[PDB]
Swiss-Prot record, chain A:
Organism: Homo sapiens
Record GO biological process: 4-hydroxyproline catabolic process; proline catabolic process; proline catabolic process to glutamate; proline metabolic process
Binding annotation for NAD(+): 179, 204, 257-261, 412
Catalytic-site annotation from UniProt: 285, 318
Protein's UniProt name: Delta-1-pyrroline-5-carboxylate dehydrogenase, mitochondrial
Residues found modified as Phosphoserine: 22
A Pfam short name: Aldedh
Reactions performed catalytically: L-glutamate 5-semialdehyde + NAD(+) + H2O = L-glutamate + NADH + 2 H(+)
Protein EC: 1.2.1.88
Length: 502, 506
């Protein structure tokens, strides 16, 4: 006849200022000192048991690679298998738990992050991942808190004669969540979202984000997350993927990272398709970005937007570099402003100097990669380094912000590189096509133009060149439920025959 | 600032009565006679070009397998590849077309089907697929019409400092739609839904549903669907799958059919993963049903529900036979009522006799399968045929509705695919019903539907928890019988100029 309901109003988390004299600035400073010198030991967590293995690993500070910030271990097949079994034992009760109940866990956690644990979380992202205040704040705080509150909201709204009804069921089995280095929030969401939906998760956090990943983990457990819903199981990547794609109980993989790696996981699952009790759901986020500038663009905006986009977090928010496309008529003006501003950019230790724009790159393997695209860069006939190009790793993995002009339109870094292509003004329409036919798995893109019709046009053309598309600014859960309709009849059935048959 | 959301209000299509004297009954009768004797030639359609190939095929009437209802051909790789390239050429314009525009096409089509073309469509499903009036009507009409209207509705209701906005883009490439035999509507939706979302489709319709599949196709084209948005390309299954999983331009497969076949398509795509410009989206619907009866159940309801569910469309709405679970205390009463009612069931030609409950099974390969299964069943020590078991294919692929009791909860044949009018019964001790519920849950691999019959409200709540993963559709005291096609682009446009690279804190 009539039902009660409850839904959920939520607001975006505020990005704090952190200005001199601010409560948040002092909180963070105290947070950072409480981390200086110290190093945390982080076990694998299966259920409520903290587990250590022979295979020990260290997370070091990127801008001070002599500082080991975390000691942790990799889980072995034995331990991963134990974690899987433990999770499955917990799954049916978890799934049956009303979503409001499960949402409340993620809401408490969001609130913990929002205030009391914000400094610790920001501090652990700065120190362990080399992020500046503003970068840690928009990721580990803002984004992550918002994921938690908004996911909770979508999940609760979802569950909001002859009587029909829908039931949103977790997937039957376990979800493997596999986090990337460059975001704290993404890791939290990779494990958090499937869990919210009544799933149990094996979470393999990124080795270069262990300290903060584990902070997020503990916060969720302190917020009420039962044991065995999310297993915290750092591990070797190949070992982990091999193990979980081999389990008959795999029902999903929630992945962020490279296209090759994903393809590989996909092929693994396909190879073992006959062993799974259910078809596994594979979610993978995998790339590129460009700034396309039209002759009408506002140069000041273009320059700051392009610098922020190219170099923030040392260009590690995107796999490749930022490709800049500048019309010839504006190039002289922009090249000057870029070079001027570039030399004003301060790269250093983000904990000590808040004036640091960006710090060191994430690790040694990463530093190596960047150096090779700097040696064998300063060679290529089509490339002239206009700025930067240096990099020293005696104290930390420090790379100078580098700017490069190319004369060749079609020439995976993860470093602070800005590539520039100067195009003739008359050939801008053909250059837009070049951007579209140049991007394989495009992440973001921006168009800069004061002409409204150039924008409308660029948007049509670049429709498949970026999943996030910005106009005059810098370019920077249903999968986990399975619906069951339940229809119910209240009157009896009558004859099996139909009228018309008589 | 203003916001303007457009909303589409739509109602469920009415299932017509078809009673003596009704306008719809006469319309259908005239429709059927206009089909008697005739046989339609159905080419492949790429763009607006009707194409024939050497490889010619015939669709026959199941209840009169001497009557060829349709002549059609299979597309070759050369034709499939031509269709693919043609579709891609049309895709960007189609995707850019406002969804309201694209929705209107599917709404006109729904309306065409709803009235003026309803009889033709019902008639071609009856005659080509062996469905009775009521079966054709709930499928080829009601459900297909509703897909069209409701999808249109959801698509339109989707597209409803700085300024944010979302854009729902079709997938970049072509979608392969692969239809099953047992539904006209499902075929329509497999091709129709991706299309609505700005996609171009290669549609491989089921060979045993060609006549009606093509009717639906032609209706859509008459409703305004541009050329090369959906290519009508009947083909050999292996050939088609091989060809489309080999295309760098594959962006999706929309499949309904068996788990093996799907797994196979999936493995094919995985194998060619490095060649695709985009990760293809694979949608597959793949199984089992059961009727679980509790001691409190209303026997009359159980009996008519179970008959309808077991035998309508000759059990072809479901790969596996219906498995009735009956408590010992009620079995005597239910066995009797089932046997009584069973013998009253008329199996025949659905076009001449509207008193036919169900007609012949879909085809010869299908008939064969059922003849073997029944033979495997019979012999077997744990199976007693209580009724039916006969089947004659001299005039059509006719199988008698068969009822079987098993003494083994885990009877193997019962796991094998039948697709025929078989009702398997398992009598369980009343005291052991909780354990029997567990048996149903631990017996279903890929469950399609399931029903619980019980007048006890707490047994129902309980059965619902336990059988939570045993059925995607679950019925209480009745018989147990698009987002994927869009990738969202977010578009932030900032109106104030930007400022310096530095930050406040810095």
């Amino acid at each position: 006849r009539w039902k009660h309901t409850s839904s959920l109003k939520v607001a975006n988390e505020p990005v704090l200022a952190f200005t001199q004299g601010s409560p948040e600035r002092d909180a963070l400073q105290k947070a950072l000192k409480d981390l200086k010198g110290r190093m945390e030991a982080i076990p694998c967590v299966v259920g409520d048991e903290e587990v250590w293995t022979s295979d020990v690993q260290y997370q070091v500070s990127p801008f001070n690679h002599g500082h080991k910030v975390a000691k942790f271990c990799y889980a072995d097949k034995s331990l991963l298998n134990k974690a899987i079994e433990a999770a499955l034992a917990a799954r049916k009760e978890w799934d049956l738990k009303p979503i409001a109940d499960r949402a409340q866990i993620f809401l408490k956690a969001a609130d913990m992050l929002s205030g009391p644990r914000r400094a610790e979380i920001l501090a652990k992202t700065m120190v362990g991942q080399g992020k500046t205040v503003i970068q840690a704040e928009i990721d580990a705080a803002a984004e992550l808190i918002d994921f938690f509150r908004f996911n909770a909201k979508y999940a609760v709204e979802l569950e909001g004669p002859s009587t029909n009804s829908t039931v949103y069921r977790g997937l039957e089995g376990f979800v493997a969540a596999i986090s990337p280095f460059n975001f704290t929030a993404i890791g939290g969401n990779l494990a958090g979202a499937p869990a919210l939906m009544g799933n149990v998760v094996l979470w393999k956090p990124s080795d270069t984000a262990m300290l903060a990943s584990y902070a997020v983990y503990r916060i969720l457990r302190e917020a009420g997350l039962p044991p065995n819903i999310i297993q915290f199981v750092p591990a070797d990547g190949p070992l982990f993927g091999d193990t979980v794609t081999s389990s008959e109980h795999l029902c999903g993989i929630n992945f962020t990272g490279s296209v090759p790696t994903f393809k590989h996981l996909w092929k693994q699952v396909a190879q073992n398709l006959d062993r799974f009790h259910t078809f596994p759901r594979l979610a993978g986020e995998c790339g590129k970005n460009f700034h396309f500038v039209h002759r009408s663009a506002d140069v000041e905006s273009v320059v700051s937007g392009t610098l922020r986009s190219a170099f923030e977090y040392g260009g590690q928010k995107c796999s490749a570099c930022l490709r800049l496309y500048v019309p010839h008529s504006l190039w002289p003006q922009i090249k000057g402003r870029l070079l001027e501003e570039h030399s004003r950019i301060k790269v250093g230790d983000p904990a000590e100097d808040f004036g640091t724009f960006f710090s060191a790159v994430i690790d040694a393997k990463s530093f190596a990669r960047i150096k090779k695209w700097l040696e064998h860069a300063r060679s290529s006939p089509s490339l002239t380094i206009l700025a930067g190009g240096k990099c020293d790793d005696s104290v930390g993995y420090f790379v100078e912000p580098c700017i490069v002009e190319s004369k060749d339109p079609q020439e995976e870094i993860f470093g602070p590189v800005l590539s520039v292509y100067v195009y003739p003004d008359d050939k801008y329409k053909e250059t837009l096509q070049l951007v579209d036919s140049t991007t394989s798995y495009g992440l973001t893109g921006a168009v800069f133009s004061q002409d409204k019709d150039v924008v409308q046009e660029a948007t049509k053309v670049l429709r498949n060149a970026a999943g996030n598309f910005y106009i005059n600014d810098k370019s920077t859960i249903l999968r986990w439920t399975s619906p069951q309709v339940i229809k119910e009849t209240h009157k009896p059935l009558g004859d099996w025959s139909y009228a018309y048959m008589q």
